[PDB]
């Protein structure tokens, strides 16, 4: 049953063209128009793409209004970062935000100093990662010992975005699914 679904489900618009000579045109082009429409929706939703270094008055808008988005429940995820330059984990998490911002343009990446965020915040609890969605806090994450701590990598951060429902599991942009071209080249030769 899955062998028929893998022709369309496991191929993007660039990979669907492989089956142009083999499979029927009406079977293939019917799905390419569907996948083409999904690509256009992501382009319209790409309202972001760099870290929004904000300040508090604005928090009451950027962090929360955005989380409502269109309010068609067009919700928008907003990853906040209570930065603290003295901590080593904070500078690591700041690099992950800019790296993920260039890839996931639909998700908003927010950064602010922790001293300016909350009155007399504990410095030991920093860096803090909050995830808003439709005005509600989906995840109040603590320091990155859960995500490896000092040895945190980009692969661990992208895996966390899938757990909170920010990115799909089978997304082609994730490093877990985005296999290298040399990897797929060896598979075709050994097939």
């Amino acid at each position: 049953a899955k062998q028929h679904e893998n022709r369309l489900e496991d191929k993007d618009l660039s990979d669907l063209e492989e089956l142009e000579d083999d499979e029927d045109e009406d079977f293939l082009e019917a799905y390419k128009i569907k996948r083409l429409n999904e690509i256009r929706k992501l382009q319209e939703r790409s309202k972001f793409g760099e870290v929004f270094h904000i300040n508090k008055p604005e928090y009451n808008k950027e962090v929360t209004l955005a989380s409502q988005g269109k309010k068609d429940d067009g919700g928008v995820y907003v990853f906040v970062h209570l930065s603290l330059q003295s901590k080593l984990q904070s500078r690591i998490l700041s690099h992950l935000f800019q790296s993920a911002a260039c890839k996931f343009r639909e998700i908003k990446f927010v950064e602010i100093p922790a001293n300016r965020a909350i009155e007399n915040y504990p410095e030991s609890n920093c860096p803090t990662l909050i995830v808003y969605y439709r005005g509600e806090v989906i995840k109040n994450m603590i320091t990155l010992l859960e995500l490896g701590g000092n040895n945190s990598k980009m692969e661990d951060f992208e895996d966390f975005m899938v757990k909170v429902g920010a990115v799909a599991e089978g997304d082609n942009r994730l490093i877990m699914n985005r296999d290298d071209e040399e990897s797929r080249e060896e598979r075709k030769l050994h097939y």
Partner: protein
């Protein structure tokens, strides 16, 4: 040849699809409507009782009219949904008689029971009621007298007809004070363009209902109020009202402008340009002297401190329906450009005062004789007393809404049903056929509205109705039942009137409700 051991037969309909033939289903559909009818039976009349409904979400909703009672109870049966559709249609078109139209619709179904038990199919009895309504609507038009022949005053007409609407509610003793509110409220509206959204009533808690006050102005309820509030004067003599759809916010909902600069000296210019633009918009509003600034979209924080300095009142986050009511009162339309403003678009009022009631604060315009709108602040003890009195005056407004379009007086207290019934009895005796017994049943069904008036009052019904049958033998009009004197008499001498559209649309809707489920013999439900 066969594929396997055995082959079970196919059911034609889907598994679980209910279906039935014969006269049992149409009797079940009629009994289903009578089951819904019995809930609204004792509600009919001034001495009737309210109905308490509590849905699955555990929200209390008390009501007297059958419009929202049937909306709360989610009806599964299609035949019982016929009473719900006409009740909402009667509520949408006229706004009165939602309980009586369901009682008349079920009574025609109730009187059609023994005729369906006979061999007469439903296509004969449909023709009899459908023939009777053609004479009933004409007889109501013939019994409709015009008010201009007497050359009476127009103000007393609305008070006379609205008094009937305030029966069977919590208002009937306090009707001396509140009937003046709705009559004066609807008269402020334009006769050519009478609108239903300009009569919005706010469900404000606290206070007794008699402590309310009618003002030609409109209130809005204080909004978010960033720091700045409670510094301006909350009382003005002749303020100028301004409305702005433009969002006075420092790039809050605006699209993200990607600003890129390459000099340090220009960085001081670009950060001050934000302050330069927002202050230019405030100075342009300041020059016109707008004492009351309003907006549907939120007002920035810096504007509140600026308007607080020059004693300018400000408020934001107003809804579209409430803001549309303001524009009908304060004259000029909305402008979303600070440079294109003009003095002539500003409104005015003779007095303005903010006062708190129910621990809530409401800005009240006062002294607006040129206003083509109105407002009502019903205060009530509980929360359902407010909502019940809210929809009650909405029904009272709906009577005077339709009375101004066409001025027709008709009898009340169940009298109009009986003069129509006895005329059909005079028409039925000359037929001498199957339609005679059907029209006599239609005359018997119209008699039910006098019954519930007497049953809820406690007096016996068979004795008093026979007295009316002896009284209606001669020529008589406006002859019904009353409860104050406990003795029947002339309703015109008792001064109770109603519109003619209530009785006309009730007979057409009740007969159409009857013919819908008498023109069927089966109800199929899948799944």
């Amino acid at each position: 040849m066969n594929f396997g051991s055995q082959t079970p037969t196919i059911v034609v309909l889907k598994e679980g699809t209910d279906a039935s033939q014969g006269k049992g289903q149409i009797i079940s559909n009629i009994n289903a409507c009578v089951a819904v009818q019995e809930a609204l039976k004792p509600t009919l009349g001034p001495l009737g009782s309210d109905i308490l409904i509590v849905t699955s979400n555990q929200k209390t909703t008390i009501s007297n009219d059958g419009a929202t009672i049937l909306k709360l109870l989610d009806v599964v049966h299609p035949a019982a949904k016929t009473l719900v559709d006409i009740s909402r249609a009667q509520d949408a078109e006229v706004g009165d008689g939602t309980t009586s139209v369901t009682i008349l619709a079920g009574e025609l179904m109730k009187e059609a029971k023994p005729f369906l038990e006979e061999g007469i199919s439903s296509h004969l009895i449909m023709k009899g009621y459908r023939k009777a309504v053609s004479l009933a609507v004409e007889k109501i038009n013939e019994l409709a007298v015009d008010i201009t022949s007497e050359k009476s005053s127009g103000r007393e007409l609305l008070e006379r007809c609205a008094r009937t609407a305030m029966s069977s509610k919590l208002i009937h003793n306090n009707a001396d004070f509140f009937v003046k509110m709705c009559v004066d409220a609807v008269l402020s509206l334009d006769r050519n363009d009478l609108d239903d959204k300009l009569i919005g009533i706010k469900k404000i808690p606290g206070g007794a209902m008699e402590e309310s006050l009618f003002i030609n102005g409109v209130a809005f309820k204080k909004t978010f109020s960033y720091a700045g509030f409670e510094q301006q004067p909350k009382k003005f003599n002749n303020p100028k009202i301004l409305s702005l759809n433009v969002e006075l916010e420092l790039k809050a909902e605006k699209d993200n402008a990607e600003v890129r600069v390459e000099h340090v000296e220009d960085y001081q210019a670009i950060v001050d340009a934000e302050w330069q633009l927002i202050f230019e918009k405030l100075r342009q509003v300041e020059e016109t002297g707008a004492n009351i600034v309003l907006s549907k979209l939120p007002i920035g924080d810096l504007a509140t401190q600026f308007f607080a300095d020059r004693n300018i009142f400000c408020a934001g986050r107003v809804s579209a329906d409430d803001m549309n009511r303001v524009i009908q009162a304060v004259g000029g339309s909305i402008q979303s450009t600070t440079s294109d403003i003009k003095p002539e678009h500003l409104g005015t009022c003779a007095l303005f005062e903010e006062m708190q009631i129910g621990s809530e604060r409401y800005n009240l315009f006062q002294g607006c004789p040129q206003a083509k709108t109105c407002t009502l602040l019903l205060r009530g003890g509980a929360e359902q007393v407010i909502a019940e009195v809210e929809r009650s005056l909405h029904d009272a407004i709906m009577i005077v809404k339709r009375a101004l379009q066409n001025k027709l007086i008709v009898a009340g207290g169940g009298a109009t049903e009986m003069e129509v019934s006895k005329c059909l009895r005079d028409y039925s005796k000359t037929i001498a056929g199957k339609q005679q017994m059907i029209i006599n049943a239609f005359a018997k069904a119209l008699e039910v509205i006098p019954r519930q008036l007497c049953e809820n009052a406690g007096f016996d019904a068979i004795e008093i109705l026979n007295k009316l049958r002896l009284a209606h033998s001669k020529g008589e009009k406006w002859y019904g039942v009353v409860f104050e004197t406990e003795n029947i008499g002339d309703n015109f001498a008792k001064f109770v009137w109603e519109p003619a559209l209530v009785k006309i649309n009730a007979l057409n809707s009740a007969t159409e409700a009857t013919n819908l489920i008498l023109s069927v013999d089966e109800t199929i439900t899948n799944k």
